[PDB]
Structure 1
Amino acid sequence: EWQENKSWNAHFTEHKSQGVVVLWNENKQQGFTNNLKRANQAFLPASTFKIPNSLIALDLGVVKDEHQVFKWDGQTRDIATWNRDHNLITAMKYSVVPVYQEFARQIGEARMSKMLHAFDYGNEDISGNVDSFWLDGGIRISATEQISFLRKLYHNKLHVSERSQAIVKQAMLTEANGDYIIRAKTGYSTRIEPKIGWWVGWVELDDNVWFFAMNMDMPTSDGLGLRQAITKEVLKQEKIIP
């Protein structure tokens, strides 16, 4: 089912912002959010799309494995970490758009479209640039739809090789300690209004898994750190993490 908990809304206004956090207890099969409405609002995925793109790139052979290097094309860009060689792990760590734009071009309009249909991903609409539709195209996805897609990836139920799904879940590794493991991906939608920041993934525990997907209003880049801070503040409130 689905319970609404508006107490979490504090964590958003405490930073003079608005957004939604959506949690899903896999063992109890129960969902929780502060805004049931916005939980189902579909937005541009932005860099969260690097998850399915990786799966498709790996499954079709565009990316052989997580060690293959993708040479910097030489064009100096405003994001410093982008102006260097990368592999799949580092490309996802620093959200290197140009690397995944090349992946999309090699994937192609036809194969990309069929795969998102197999994934049941968002509105399944890739209209726009094959190499930028997830930034300024027609694809839309809600927080709950992120949760549903991520759950499939966790259980290796997507229609790609088990190896492909493991590698992506490896590249999603973000934080790990004696208490929890976080596999997730961030996103920053700016090319089309409204500007929002994403953070989608799950928190692994000893005997349970909590999937999460959040988006928030992101007028400027000064609040990108809140994507993780607010989510973690909610996780701790619900005693999922210390």
Structure 2
Amino acid sequence: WQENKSWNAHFTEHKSQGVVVLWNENKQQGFTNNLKRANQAFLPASTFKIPNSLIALDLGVVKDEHQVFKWDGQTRDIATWNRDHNLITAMKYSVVPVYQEFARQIGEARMSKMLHAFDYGNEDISGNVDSFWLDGGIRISATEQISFLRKLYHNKLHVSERSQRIVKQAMLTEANGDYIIRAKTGYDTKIGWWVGWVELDDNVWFFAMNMDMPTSDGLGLRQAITKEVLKQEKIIP
């Protein structure tokens, strides 16, 4: 692990504070602007959709990325939520109600057992079974997110290979001739997250970032600051 404080200028430039963690898979080396915060644990919020999806697929709660999760007829503030969804759109729009239903069907016992099998964060599901990742006891750090993602990337998690391939497909965020990003956003009213990885032709760079997010004003910063770090390190052009 190497600390590079020069990344802090990207945060300063945006009147923000946070951590970016990068892992170079080929070199097995990590880099971050703040080693201490890199190892501090926070509520995952919607980044929890990654393990939740995996578990739901492995248990058959979700069949595949095409199955329709019918809208439950309750109108909610976020317009995109008020419609039918599949795994791809549910991830893309972070549709909380669909995942809450998943969590209820999974149940606390299977949920707790799976997170333990995954070595996921503090592995604590205390609170409501359908909301612990938003306001309950579970915590994970940026470095822990990287460890978890590395296992997912290599199909090493304790679910089927098929479930893992499907979730990586659903994580697809951006792709062009230069790179591919597979990732998940999250935010909880105190912290904003972006975790995932960048696929290059001959390497993979895992990333996990979080930042203080007093208002939702700055949500776009999660990707922007990360990309500035990626640009500075020449990972993307």
> Matches of 2:147 and 2:188 in 1, distance apart?
21
Alignment of 1:1-242 (within 5 A): 2-190=1-189, 195-242=190-237
> Identity, % of aligned pairs?
99
Deviation at 1:41, TM superposition (A): 0.5
> Matches of 2:46 and 2:154 in 1, distance apart?
22
Q: Secondary structure at 1:216's aligned position in 2? A: strand
> Matches of 1:218 and 1:80 in 2, distance apart?
22
> Matches of 2:148 and 2:223 in 1, distance apart?
20
Post-superposition CA distance 1:104-162 (Å, at most 9, x none): 00000000000000000000000001000000000000000000000000000001000
Post-superposition CA distance 1:136-192 (Å, at most 9, x none): 0000000000000000000000010000000000000000000000000000012xx
Unaligned 5+ residue runs, structure 1?
A: none
Q: Aligned Cα RMSD in Å?
A: 0.4
TM-score where L is the length of structure 1 = 0.98
Deviation at 1:42, TM superposition (A): 0.0
Deviation at 1:30, TM superposition (A): 0.3
- Worse-matched range after superposition: 74-83 or 103-112: 74-83
Post-superposition CA distance 1:25-73 (Å, at most 9, x none): 0000000000000000100000000000000000000000000001111
> Matches of 1:99 and 1:61 in 2, distance apart?
15
Deviation at 1:13, TM superposition (A): 1.1
> Matches of 2:12 and 2:103 in 1, distance apart?
37
- Worse-matched range after superposition: 68-77 or 148-157: 68-77
> Matches of 1:62 and 1:151 in 2, distance apart?
24
4+ residue runs of structure 1 moved beyond 6 angstroms? none
Q: Secondary structure at 1:186's aligned position in 2? A: strand
Q: Secondary structure at 1:239's aligned position in 2? A: coil
> Matches of 2:83 and 2:12 in 1, distance apart?
38
> Matches of 1:118 and 1:98 in 2, distance apart?
25
Unaligned 5+ residue runs, structure 2?
A: none
> Matches of 1:213 and 1:19 in 2, distance apart?
11
> Matches of 1:18 and 1:176 in 2, distance apart?
28
Q: Secondary structure at 2:155's aligned position in 1? A: coil
> Matches of 2:94 and 2:12 in 1, distance apart?
27
Q: Secondary structure at 1:178's aligned position in 2? A: coil
Q: Secondary structure at 1:200's aligned position in 2? A: strand
Q: Secondary structure at 2:15's aligned position in 1? A: coil
> Matches of 2:212 and 2:75 in 1, distance apart?
29
> Matches of 1:151 and 1:141 in 2, distance apart?
15
> Matches of 1:30 and 1:153 in 2, distance apart?
18
> Matches of 2:104 and 2:7 in 1, distance apart?
41
> Matches of 2:72 and 2:27 in 1, distance apart?
48
- Aligned pair count reads 237
